[PDB]
Symmetry: C2
Subunit: 306 residues, 2 copies
C-alpha cells in the first residue's frame, strides 16, 4: 500500500560514474567498457560557451589534456572523438563494473531515474519524465553535467539521458547517449526557450487509477464520456489528446479496478472543470502526470530487479 515517486536502484550506475576535467572545467562522465562518455562542452572555457565552434576547439586538444578520474584512480586516454554533442574518450582500462546495458532514445511522457553527480561522485537519485516539450524538471547544481538518466529492465540498464544544460525557466535539457538533444536545444549559452508545457493525460489517468487502488475514491462520479468529448476538454487545459493506444495501455489498470477508462476520463474532466476544492489525491492538491501506466503497475504488482 501507498504510492511514491520511486527511482530504480542506482547501484549498477554508481560503478560507472567518473570525473572528467579539461583545464578549469570539471564534470561527470559515464565509464562503460573502455569508453568514457561526457558532454563535449567540457572543452569550453567560460568565454567559449557564448558561440563555441566545437570542431575548432577540439583541434587544440590531445588525449593527454583529458583528466579522467575513477574514484581516486586516474585513467589513461588512448583516443578521443566527438559524436554530436558527446565526447567519447577511449581509455586503456575496461570498467570491471560495466553492467549489462543499452542506449535508448526515450519518447516524451516516458519516465526514468537520474543519478545526480558532482566530480564523478553520486549525490542522490530521483524519478523524472521527458515532458512533451522535451525538457525535464530535475535538480542539477553546477558540475551536475554528464549525470545520466536510466531505466532497469530485469538485469539490463537502459541509459536514455545525459544532462547538459538549464533553460531560463530553471528546467533542464540534455541528450541521449549518442549525443542528440531531446528537443531543439543546442549546447551554447544563448536565449533558448521551451515550447508550451502540455500535460501527459495518459499518466494523469494512471495516477487516478493508482489513487483508487490505494483507497482514495472521492473523485469517482456517476458519469462516463467519449474520447472526442474528453479531448474537447483536454485542448482547453493543454492536456495531450487521448487515443485508443492510451486506452489499451490503461486496460490492466481498468481491468484490476473494474473501472472503464472512459468513466475515469469523466472523473478527470470534472477535476479539470471544478478543480479539487482543497481535497487531495495521494497527498497531492494537483494532478500528477509523471507516472506512466508501467510505473503504476510495477508499484501495485511489486516487481524486483537482480
Amino acid at each position: 500500500s501507498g504510492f511514491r515517486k520511486m527511482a530504480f536502484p542506482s547501484g549498477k550506475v554508481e560503478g560507472c560514474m567518473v570525473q572528467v576535467t579539461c583545464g578549469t572545467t570539471t564534470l561527470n562522465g559515464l565509464w562503460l567498457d573502455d569508453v568514457v562518455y561526457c558532454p563535449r562542452h567540457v572543452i569550453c572555457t567560460s568565454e567559449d560557451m557564448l558561440n563555441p565552434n566545437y570542431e575548432d576547439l577540439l583541434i587544440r586538444k590531445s588525449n593527454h589534456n583529458f583528466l579522467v578520474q575513477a574514484g581516486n584512480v586516474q585513467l589513461r586516454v588512448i583516443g578521443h572523438s566527438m559524436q554530436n554533442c558527446v565526447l567519447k574518450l577511449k581509455v586503456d582500462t575496461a570498467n570491471p563494473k560495466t553492467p549489462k546495458y543499452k542506449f535508448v532514445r526515450i519518447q516524451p511522457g516516458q519516465t526514468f531515474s537520474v543519478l545526480a553527480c558532482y566530480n564523478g561522485s553520486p549525490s542522490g537519485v530521483y524519478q523524472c519524465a521527458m515532458r512533451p516539450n522535451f525538457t525535464i524538471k530535475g535538480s542539477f547544481l553546477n558540475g551536475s553535467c554528464g549525470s545520466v538518466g536510466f531505466n532497469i529492465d530485469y538485469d539490463c540498464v537502459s541509459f536514455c539521458y545525459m544532462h547538459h544544460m538549464e533553460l531560463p525557466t530553471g528546467v533542464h535539457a540534455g541528450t541521449d547517449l549518442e549525443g542528440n538533444f531531446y528537443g531543439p536545444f543546442v549546447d551554447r549559452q544563448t536565449a533558448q526557450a521551451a515550447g508550451t508545457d502540455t500535460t501527459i493525460t495518459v499518466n494523469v489517468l494512471a495516477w487516478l487509477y493508482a489513487a483508487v487502488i490505494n483507497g482514495d475514491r472521492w473523485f469517482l462520479n456517476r458519469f462516463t464520456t467519449t474520447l472526442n468529448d474528453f479531448n474537447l476538454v483536454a485542448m482547453k487545459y493543454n492536456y495531450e489528446p487521448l487515443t485508443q493506444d492510451h486506452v489499451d495501455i490503461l486496460g490492466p489498470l481498468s481491468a484490476q479496478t473494474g473501472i472503464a477508462v472512459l468513466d475515469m476520463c469523466a472523473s478527470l474532466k470534472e477535476l479539470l472543470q471544478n478543480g479539487m476544492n482543497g481535497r487531495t489525491i495521494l497527498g497531492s492538491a494537483l494532478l500528477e502526470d509523471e507516472f506512466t501506466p508501467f510505473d503504476v503497475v510495477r508499484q501495485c504488482s511489486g516487481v524486483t530487479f537482480q
Copy 2:
C-alpha cells in the same frame, strides 16, 4: 537549480539485501558482517499474527528452519536470537560487501531513504520522514518487510528503519535495527491507530527557503511576526510549535537568502490563513514538510558521497 525529493544512492545497501524464509513466509533481511537482521514475524503463520507469543514460537525453531538466500546462493545459519522485534541470524559467511555502517535511532521530523525490496531483490528507492506520530508514508507491498531506511554520512551508512507493518490508514510502522518500534506499535495484527499527524513546521520553512533560492518568491510579504504570535497560529493547524533551535538550524538558509526566519514565518502564517489561491510553490499546491534544513542545504550546496 530545481528541487526534488531525492534519495541517497542505494548501491552500498543493495549489496546487503537477502531473502529470509520460514515455512511459507518470505521477507527481506539485512546482511552485515556474519549477521542477518529481519523482522521476527517471519516465524509467524497467517494464523499466529492475531496474538503471537514470539518466545514460544521461536522455541519450535532451529537454525536449519531459516532459509537465508543472497542472490542465488544459500547462506548457512549457525546461530539465531531475538532482540526486541528483530531476529539476528548468525551465518558463517561474512558479507564481503558490508559497507562501513552504524545503527541510529532517528528523531521524528528527520528524513531517510528507503530501499523497498521483494524476495531480497531491490525494487526502488525513495525519501521518507519519520512523522511526529512515528509513522511513515511509504510504498510497501506484500513481502516488502525487512526493507530498510538509511542515511549516508560521507562513506558511512546509518541504518535507522526496518519495515514491519501497515496501519488501517495505509501508513507504515517499523523498528530501528535494534528492533524497538518507533511509536507505540506492536508486531501483532490488531486494531492499532496513529495519533494526530502534526506538520513539521521547521521543514515547511526549509522548503519555503528552497523555493526562494529557486526563484519562486510570490508568497513573500511585507510582514514579520514573533515566535509566540506564529505558534498561536501553528496550534490551530496542527503544526509543531517552533523554538529557537529551529531558528538557529535555519540560520544558514536565512543567511544565504538574507531573509530573517520570522519574516518567513509571517509568509507561512499568511499561507495557513489564506491558503494558496491555486498558486504553486516548487510545483506543489500544498505545504511540503518532508525536507529538513539539512536536506535543503545539501541540494542547494551540492555535496557528494564516496
